[model samples]
Target: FRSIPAITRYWFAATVAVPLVGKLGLISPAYLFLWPEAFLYRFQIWRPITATFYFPVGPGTGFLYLVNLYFLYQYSTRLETGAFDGRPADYLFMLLFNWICIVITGLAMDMQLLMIPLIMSVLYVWAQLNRDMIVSFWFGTRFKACYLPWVILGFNYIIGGSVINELIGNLVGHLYFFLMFRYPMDLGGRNFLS
Candidate 1:
């Protein structure tokens, strides 16, 4: 626990704990919904943050939730330890940017699940930052890191019939990349992230 990055550690803790809290009947599971109406009107302001961390716990969805947990720990640790090493503030700012984007998009799309997008956004940014790195998928298929996010997008679309979450992640990831890296390096603009 002490070895893991602070942000990733806390995030993984919440990700794992929230569902268990729901399963234990500590809180009504309905509180996890990211409903904009409840957030804006009902003044259930915690809904957005709660919804971001709480995943539905059950046999049918347990596997995916585990997968999300794995990625949240794996890629987030990679980013914090690799690209964002010694730069917790920048990494956290990137996360904040994506979280805000995901929340807005989730509200507009009426999507209740955001953990996927949050993890996907972290993976997307890590993929872009390590563009030259090699990555493998099922059946031994291989590709450069940059293609990883799109492959996940298409894979999710084919498997789930909904690309909104993945698309939102990719867009948010790209926006951060553009603002943090591309804009400053490619166009000689000031560092927006700093």
Candidate 2:
């Protein structure tokens, strides 16, 4: 907490605190609504943002939620501090782009659980930025950073029995990387962040 940057710390706090507050009955359903209709017509505009932080607080999903939160905190902080260090605006722009992409795609996927893709998107970008670095997973298996995101995608498919979320994250992350980094750097063009 004392060492983490402000944006990352605040994001971690909101995700953890909002769900805990809801679980303890201190907040109730305030953190439980995320239907698109609410955002479209009912004027419950906060649903989208709040729902992004909402995760089931019981034993059924608590462990998974914590794992997701850890990844969100760890990888996001790494990106913010390592690659995008001292460039908060660009990092936030990446987040905003991915978030918009997720919401747009989620409308059809009916994705109320946005944290998965949101965190995964960050992981994808971090993996890209650190493509030369090697990463070791469980069982002493090691691989280049570029394969990390896909490996997790496969693992998620096996363990979670769904690849949609990871697919969305990969798609959005690649789109962002291509548009923001590859296109501008390799193709001589302006990036969205620019």
Candidate 3:
């Protein structure tokens, strides 16, 4: 709702700035924010999102911002509204998840590609902590106005190749976001229409 935090604002700015200087069609790859390596720790495979982050000014930034801004926007407005913990729980969770994936991927898989689920799990929990929020852009013509990010998070587990992992992550996130942090958060509040 309100402006995103300063650090995230910087990321949005930096992600879009890199390619702006490569004028005259000089940039070989204009989009680079989507590269996994851009955000993933060292010892990862070809990062999938470097281009997305690097070229934040492009149209692709729509999806990137929508998804990326989900947490930022929520944290900014909902933090004091009891949607999330005022302490550093979300920050700690993010750090813990990032390192967990880095270690798991680096030691066992030889490639961080397998760590995407772990990353998604962490993010899903973070998003869950700040539940019942709406995300909008471009004067709100298009909107993702629900807790459906959980479903998308579940799908991430599928993409990371594990339905069980997806369910576990979603369950944990749901429990914490809804049950533990039940200030105003809803527990899978809606069922799909039959």
Task: Please name the candidate that would achieve the greatest TM-score relative to the true structure.
Answer: 1
lDDT by residue (tens digit), candidate 1, 1-194: 56735445877777878888888988888767878777766877878888888888777766777777877777787766676666466666677888998898788888887888878887888887776765556565665557777877777777785777677887888888888865564232335543
Q: What global local distance difference test value does model 3 have?
A: 0.43
For candidate 2, write residues 61-123 as lDDT tens digits: 567687887788778777766767675666767777888889878877777878788888888
Worst 10 residues of 1 by lDDT: 185-194
Tens-digit lDDT track of model 3 for 126-147:
5555445566346764655434
At residue 170, give the lDDT of candidate 2. 81
Distance from true location, Cα of 156 in model 3, Å = 10
Each model's C-alpha lDDT?
Answer: 0.75, 0.74, 0.43
TM-score, per-candidate, Cα-based: 0.84, 0.84, 0.36
Best by lDDT: 1
